[PDB]
Design a protein around this ligand. Structure first.
Ligand SMILES: [Cl-]
Ligand SMILES: [Cl-]
Lengths: 157, 157
């Protein structure tokens, strides 16, 4: 089938879970999936723990990433390194789905060029589906997306 | 950019020229193009003569193709051989545009499986543009196409 781009944005909770839920279904179906998490959690990775043993490549941002204004050079460089993996995936004809978790902040803080993104998305293997997660998704990215679900928080605990 | 699928259909004259005109522009721009002509002309190939020396691969149906009812087996086999080239092109990340001239008759006479077509189109490299020419284009193909121009014959000589 033709791979599409899906975006899970908005301020509501479940963006990441949605993306991992899709991935889970894909794997359950025998598809090849690759994952990039631009934001390293200070906890244990349930999703990774689950999926990884199933041949799902995982790429997580380095611990060293600081988000500090005076560290833009180093942080940009760490983001670039992790995104290299992402571009590679976005170039793999054998990967049925690619997950770019928390990609929106990387763009929103200018740690990665939107243009590289657009380009990478555009040139991907036709059967490839890509899932983008994160609050405040860049409009240009939304314009390119096939599906956009906005998690609106009706209530939050 | 994102490669699209363009269809030049209808009964008006210029379907092929349109497709070659697009190809000419692409080459003029430095793009890589590949061509498949499902129908062998009994004349000299102006387009081929022109484009070929520019590194444009050309794939023409074998002379042996008959269109004869009692030769479906052999003709199907010749079509399949030529289409193998087409699928290959439709799989090349380095080809910016692929031209499938007179592809509509191959589908319309069942010499090539529409399903193989849809599939090949769907899985192509994201930056790839494909041009399909021919009268009576299968609807399913039209549904998948980004642009569809129908050559309506207002007058004919
Ligand atoms: Cl979540
Ligand atoms: Cl013509």
């Amino acid at each position: 089938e033709r791979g599409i781009i899906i975006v899970f944005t908005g301020n509501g909770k479940g963006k990441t879970t949605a993306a991992f839920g899709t991935a889970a279904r894909a794997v359950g179906h025998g598809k090849n999936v690759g994952v990039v998490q631009f934001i390293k959690g200070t906890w244990p990775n349930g999703e990774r723990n689950l999926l990884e043993p199933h041949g799902v490549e995982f790429q997580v941002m380095a611990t060293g990433f600081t988000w500090e204004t005076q560290n833009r050079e180093a942080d940009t460089a760490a983001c670039m390194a992790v995104w290299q993996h992402g571009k590679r995936m976005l170039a793999d004809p054998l990967l049925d789905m690619v997950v770019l978790d928390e990609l929106t902040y990387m763009v929103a803080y200018d740690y990665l060029p939107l243009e590289e993104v657009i380009s990478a998305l555009n040139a991907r293997p036709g059967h490839q589906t890509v899932i983008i997660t994160g609050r405040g998704c860049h409009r240009d990215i939304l314009d390119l997306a096939d599906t956009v679900s906005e998690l609106r928080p009706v209530k939050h605990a």
